Amino acid sequence: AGLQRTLVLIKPDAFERSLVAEIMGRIEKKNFKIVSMKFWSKAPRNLIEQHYKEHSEQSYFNDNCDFMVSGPIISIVYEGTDAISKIRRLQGNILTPGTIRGDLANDIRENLIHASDSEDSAVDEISIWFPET
Amino acid sequence: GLQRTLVLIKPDAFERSLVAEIMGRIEKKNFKIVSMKFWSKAPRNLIEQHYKEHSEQSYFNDNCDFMVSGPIISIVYEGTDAISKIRRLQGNILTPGTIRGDLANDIRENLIHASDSEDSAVDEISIWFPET
Amino acid sequence: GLQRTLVLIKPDAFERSLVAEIMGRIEKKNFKIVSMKFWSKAPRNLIEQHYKEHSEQSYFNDNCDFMVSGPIISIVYEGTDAISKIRRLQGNILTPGTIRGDLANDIRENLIHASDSEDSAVDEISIWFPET
Amino acid sequence: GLQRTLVLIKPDAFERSLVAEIMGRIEKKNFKIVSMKFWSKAPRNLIEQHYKEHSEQSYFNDNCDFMVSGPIISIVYEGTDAISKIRRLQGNILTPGTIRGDLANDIRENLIHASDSEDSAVDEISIWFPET
Amino acid sequence: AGLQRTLVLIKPDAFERSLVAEIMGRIEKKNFKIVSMKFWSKAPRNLIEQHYKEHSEQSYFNDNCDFMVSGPIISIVYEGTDAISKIRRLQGNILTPGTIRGDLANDIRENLIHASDSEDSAVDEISIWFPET
Amino acid sequence: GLQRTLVLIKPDAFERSLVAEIMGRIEKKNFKIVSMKFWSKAPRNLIEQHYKEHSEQSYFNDNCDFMVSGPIISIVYEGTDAISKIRRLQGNILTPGTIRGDLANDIRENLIHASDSEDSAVDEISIWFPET
Numbered sequence: 001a002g003l004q005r006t007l008v009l010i011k012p013d014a015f016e017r018s019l020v021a022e023i024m025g026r027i028e029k030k031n032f033k034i035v036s037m038k039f040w041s042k043a044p045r046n047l048i049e050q051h052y053k054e055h056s057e058q059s060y061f062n063d064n065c066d067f068m069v070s071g072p073i074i075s076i077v078y079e080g081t082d083a084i085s086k087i088r089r090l091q092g093n094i095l096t097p098g099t100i101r102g103d104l105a106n107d108i109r110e111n112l113i114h115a116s117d118s119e120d121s122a123v124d125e126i127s128i129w130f131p132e133t
Numbered sequence: 134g135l136q137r138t139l140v141l142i143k144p145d146a147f148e149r150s151l152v153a154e155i156m157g158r159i160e161k162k163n164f165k166i167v168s169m170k171f172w173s174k175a176p177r178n179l180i181e182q183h184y185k186e187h188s189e190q191s192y193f194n195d196n197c198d199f200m201v202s203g204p205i206i207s208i209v210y211e212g213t214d215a216i217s218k219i220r221r222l223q224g225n226i227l228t229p230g231t232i233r234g235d236l237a238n239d240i241r242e243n244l245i246h247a248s249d250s251e252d253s254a255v256d257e258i259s260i261w262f263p264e265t
Numbered sequence: 266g267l268q269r270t271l272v273l274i275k276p277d278a279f280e281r282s283l284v285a286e287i288m289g290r291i292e293k294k295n296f297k298i299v300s301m302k303f304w305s306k307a308p309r310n311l312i313e314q315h316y317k318e319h320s321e322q323s324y325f326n327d328n329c330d331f332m333v334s335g336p337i338i339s340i341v342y343e344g345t346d347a348i349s350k351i352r353r354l355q356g357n358i359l360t361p362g363t364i365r366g367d368l369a370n371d372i373r374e375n376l377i378h379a380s381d382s383e384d385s386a387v388d389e390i391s392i393w394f395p396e397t
Numbered sequence: 398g399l400q401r402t403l404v405l406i407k408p409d410a411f412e413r414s415l416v417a418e419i420m421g422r423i424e425k426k427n428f429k430i431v432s433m434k435f436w437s438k439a440p441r442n443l444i445e446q447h448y449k450e451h452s453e454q455s456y457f458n459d460n461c462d463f464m465v466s467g468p469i470i471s472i473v474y475e476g477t478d479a480i481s482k483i484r485r486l487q488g489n490i491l492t493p494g495t496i497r498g499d500l501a502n503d504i505r506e507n508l509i510h511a512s513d514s515e516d517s518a519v520d521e522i523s524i525w526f527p528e529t
Numbered sequence: 530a531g532l533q534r535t536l537v538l539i540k541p542d543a544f545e546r547s548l549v550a551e552i553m554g555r556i557e558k559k560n561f562k563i564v565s566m567k568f569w570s571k572a573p574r575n576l577i578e579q580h581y582k583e584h585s586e587q588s589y590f591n592d593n594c595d596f597m598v599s600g601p602i603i604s605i606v607y608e609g610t611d612a613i614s615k616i617r618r619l620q621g622n623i624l625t626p627g628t629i630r631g632d633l634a635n636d637i638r639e640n641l642i643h644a645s646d647s648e649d650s651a652v653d654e655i656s657i658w659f660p661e662t
Numbered sequence: 663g664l665q666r667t668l669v670l671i672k673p674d675a676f677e678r679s680l681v682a683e684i685m686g687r688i689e690k691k692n693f694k695i696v697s698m699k700f701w702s703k704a705p706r707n708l709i710e711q712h713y714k715e716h717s718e719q720s721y722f723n724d725n726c727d728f729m730v731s732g733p734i735i736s737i738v739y740e741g742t743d744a745i746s747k748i749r750r751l752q753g754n755i756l757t758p759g760t761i762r763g764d765l766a767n768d769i770r771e772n773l774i775h776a777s778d779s780e781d782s783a784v785d786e787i788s789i790w791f792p793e794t
């Protein structure tokens with residue numbers, strides 16, 4: 001059919017603010033299924049830098065890494081019809097009410113969640129967090 | 134500009150236990166229930182009539198099969214700008230914040246139907262609530 | 266031990282926009298809707314019959330007046346241990362966690378009615394859904 | 398980045414018991430309460446100053462009467478880009494996902510007020526919290 | 530009728546954990562109305578000690594005061610039928626799911642909310658937080 | 663005061679999409695996730711060890727098959743009095759306010775498992791997280 005898989009990361013601020021179930025629930029209610037899930041008490045900076053390698057040239061690149069390893073994170077692989085962009089739309093941004101970041105986040109860096117933005121990004125990101133491909 | 138529109142809560146809503154969730158979103162936008170019917174299984178006739186305008190489409194038959202594969206609730210809602218607002222509340226599976234935007238993810242199994250114009254509203258209401 | 270019980274959603278539920286909230290609590294406990302009717306204003310006859318056992322009480326007349334001062338929904342729910350469980354779900358205005366425990370605060374305006382025994386269930390269902 | 402904006406929870410919010418619901422959406426977006434006051438009935442001169450930029454509109458008088466028809470809560474929220482962000486949260490009755498889009502459906506009884514600019518924010522805050 | 534007024538205090542841990550609306554919403558949904566409300570960025574230890582004067586002899590008395598002034602608090606006066614005990618039952622304790630403390634709290638001291646436990650306590654507590662009686 | 667207990671989110675939880683709902687109730691009670699694992703299908707020997715104290719019961723085999731009929735999540739929660747508190751949160755299908763009381767209605771498909779003692783907690787955690 002139109003089956004797809006995408007990679008989501010629940011960020012440290014999510015645990016800090018007790019919004020983990022809240023975020024996962026929004027994705028769950030949109031009818032997406034967990035295919036793989038891993039809890040990281042503290043992720044290796046290595047994986048983070050690979051995950052954000054495309055951003056290695058930006059000014060915010062190192063502070064973002066500091067943050068991404070400042071607390072726990074959960075890497076999840078969701079599956080569903082048109083999953084990559086639907087979950088991306090669900091993630092939204094801090095300016096659009098109705099989405100996860102729009103309702104719960106308010107910072108350029110501490111935005112609670114990451115979602116693959118394309119097929120190439122997904123395949124690559126999933127490989128990073130679930131090497132046992 | 135007070136109006137009345139027709140809403141159908143689809144089988145997938147019962148399957149996934151989202152009936153109250155959906156009705157609650159409409160109720161909280163302050164629209165009232167004027168009439169309502171519960172159908173364990175809707176008569177295929179009614180369904181075909183409801184989607185008459187689609188009889189020529191390729192998705193017609195399967196859609197009917199689905200619309201009868203479970204219970205459905207027919208509801209007539211009243212309120213200011215009801216048709217337009219409930220339609221907007223229904224949304225689509227792309228934009229978060231709406232019923233379909235937050236809970237649906239299929240082009241066919243989209244939980245709810247809402248009239249899209251004054252004309253279809255009057256017609257749809259007559260189909261499910263002939264007693265008028 | 267599959268059963269069917271009758272539930273009435275009272276006027277105060279429509280007044281306070283808690284209809285979906287209440288139906289959602291029952292739906293989430295996994296009980297299904299077997300039949301349902303919406304009444305803009307319930308016929309006083311039905312109400313008097315429903316509360317027959319109370320005809321001698323001092324609160325009878327006022328209760329009837331209230332039960333007809335707004336819309337009400339009659340619902341027949343099915344499920345394992347339905348009568349007992351939905352009754353427990355209905356609770357009372359003292360114990361938090363139940364429908365009345367979290368949302369009601371009056372001895373008369375308590376949002377919902379649920380049969381309390383196998384006998385009253387069969388009788389109550391016959392009153393609102395004679396077509397049996 | 399830090400800003401402070403003034404929000405007013407309107408009479409209809411108390412009537413419909415949506416006060417916690419509204420304040421909750423702002424709290425979940427991570428904004429903090431700096432100041433807050435509950436008015437069982439706000440002094441009319443305060444309301445008129447608050448809407449002074451509207452003093453020549455046809456709806457001015459009626460709106461002020463509505464704002465004085467019940468309690469209201471004035472709150473000073475602090476947070477990054479607070480003015481713009483809380484303004485978008487409020488939205489309008491045509492935008493699902495926002496406060497007015499999900500819970501309001503009237504041109505006047507629209508549950509909430511939020512400053513629309515830095516000047517209006519500064520002016521409005523001094524109106525409800527002159528003690529600074 | 531059976532009209533009553535009671536005094537509720539939203540505690541510092543409530544703001545810390547962003548549970549203020551949540552708590553007030555549970556009381557709001559049970560059909561109780563706010564008659565007076567005051568926001569304290571930091572309450573004067575004086576009022577706290579008066580509020581808990583009956584506990585002045587307990588070991589936990591000073592730490593509880595330290596906490597009660599460690600952050601903001603909101604004093605509210607609710608009104609409704611049988612308000613004092615109904616709101617008291619709503620408050621519940623950390624061992625009873627279904628109540629505010631039962632669902633959201635988990636400590637002997639940081640328990641999110643205070644509710645008058647009797648008519649005498651209410652009248653006295655209300656006087657403490659709303660002297661303009 | 664600090665304890666650590668083992669929780670299992672059962673297959674029915676994924677089937678009924680109640681995973682976030684269940685985990686949310688534990689998260690809102692202030693318990694923290696220490697360890698967590700998702701199993702699309704848990705190895706049967708793990709389930710049998712987990713319920714080894716039940717190995718002689720008539721329901722043993724059927725329960726194990728149910729526990730292997732879908733994904734499950736094993737979590738180690740840490741918090742003050744975690745074992746007892748999370749146990750009460752789980753409750754039973756007769757107790758409104760708890761997880762099973764609000765969402766479950768079966769003797770076997772009861773959505774969640776939580777250690778009932780310090781020894782069982784210690785044993786259970788080593789079964790799902792032997793890497794310690």
Ligand SMILES: Cc1cn([C@H]2C[C@H](O)[C@@H](COP(=O)(O)OP(=O)(O)O)O2)c(=O)[nH]c1=O
Pocket residue numbers: 055060061063064093108109110111114
């Ligand atoms: C733009 C930006 C991003 N970041 C971090 C957090 C962002 O989620 C991450 C990726 O940036 P980006 O791709 O711009 O946003 P999204 O995550 O919405 O695609 O980099 C900052 O820390 N500061 C910034 O200014």
Ligand SMILES: Cc1cn([C@H]2C[C@H](O)[C@@H](COP(=O)(O)OP(=O)(O)O)O2)c(=O)[nH]c1=O
Pocket residue numbers: 192195196240241242243246249
């Ligand atoms: C377009 C389309 C519709 N349908 C069914 C389900 C749609 O809800 C129903 C009506 O279609 P439509 O009128 O295009 O959308 P809405 O219901 O948003 O106005 O027809 C399909 O089964 N497959 C399709 O490709």
Ligand SMILES: Cc1cn([C@H]2C[C@H](O)[C@@H](COP(=O)(O)OP(=O)(O)O)O2)c(=O)[nH]c1=O
Pocket residue numbers: 324327328372373374375378381
């Ligand atoms: C006891 C009582 C009941 N009533 C009305 C509303 C009650 O829901 C209805 C039925 O009473 P009852 O059977 O005692 O309670 P339940 O509905 O919990 O079984 O009668 C009053 O109006 N005043 C009263 O004092």
Ligand SMILES: Cc1cn([C@H]2C[C@H](O)[C@@H](COP(=O)(O)OP(=O)(O)O)O2)c(=O)[nH]c1=O
Pocket residue numbers: 456459460504505506507510511513
């Ligand atoms: C435009 C308009 C506003 N009002 C009232 C309610 C509006 O919230 C208030 C302020 O007007 P306005 O600034 O247009 O709306 P907002 O509050 O979205 O900026 O005036 C009316 O009563 N009638 C009207 O036609």
Ligand SMILES: Cc1cn([C@H]2C[C@H](O)[C@@H](COP(=O)(O)OP(=O)(O)O)O2)c(=O)[nH]c1=O
Pocket residue numbers: 584589590592593622637638639640643
């Ligand atoms: C019993 C106790 C109370 N306290 C503080 C917080 C309690 O909410 C407050 C009042 O105690 P108490 O009357 O026992 O509980 P409640 O507040 O449920 O009536 O004193 C402690 O700090 N430690 C304790 O051991």
Ligand SMILES: Cc1cn([C@H]2C[C@H](O)[C@@H](COP(=O)(O)OP(=O)(O)O)O2)c(=O)[nH]c1=O
Pocket residue numbers: 721724725769770771772775776778
């Ligand atoms: C008692 C019982 C349990 N079970 C299954 C589901 C129970 O959750 C599991 C463990 O039994 P038990 O310890 O009695 O329940 P809990 O999980 O509340 O401690 O065994 C059955 O399938 N049939 C039964 O009759």
Ligand SMILES: [Mg+2]
Pocket residue numbers: 117
């Ligand atoms: Mg990106």
Ligand SMILES: [Mg+2]
Pocket residue numbers: 249
């Ligand atoms: Mg259409």
Ligand SMILES: [Mg+2]
Pocket residue numbers: 381
């Ligand atoms: Mg009775």
Ligand SMILES: [Mg+2]
Pocket residue numbers: 513
């Ligand atoms: Mg304005």
Ligand SMILES: [Mg+2]
Pocket residue numbers: 646
């Ligand atoms: Mg006390």
Ligand SMILES: [Mg+2]
Pocket residue numbers: 778
């Ligand atoms: Mg057990």
